[PDB]
Design a protein around this ligand. Structure first.
Ligand SMILES: [Ca+2]
Length: 94
């Protein structure tokens, strides 16, 4: 809500990372490696120790095809809510 709104501002940071690693703006286009790259950016950005990387061995098409419910089961507690907010914004906007 207030925390989600505030932390949404740092998501802009990933745009610099996308240009850096040649990650397309639209997640539908992402390779299994570019999905991993997004999760590694977040692991560093938000200091994580367990993004379930083995659970995200998928293309950007599969990632886009998971809904909020499946995404949150797979992703770690509270962190999943942060990642979902970023993912859904990227799908909606680019
Ligand atoms: Ca789109």
């Amino acid at each position: 809500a207030v925390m989600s709104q505030a932390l949404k501002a740092t998501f802009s940071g990933f745009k610099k990372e996308q240009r850096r690693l040649g990650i397309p703006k639209n997640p539908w286009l992402w390779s299994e490696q570019q999905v991993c790259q997004w999760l590694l950016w977040a692991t560093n950005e938000f200091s994580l120790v367990n993004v379930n990387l083995q659970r995200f061995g998928m293309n950007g098409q599969m990632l886009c095809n998971l809904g909020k419910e499946r995404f949150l089961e797979l992703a770690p507690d509270f962190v999943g809510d942060i990642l979902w907010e970023h993912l859904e914004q990227m799908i909606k906007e680019n």
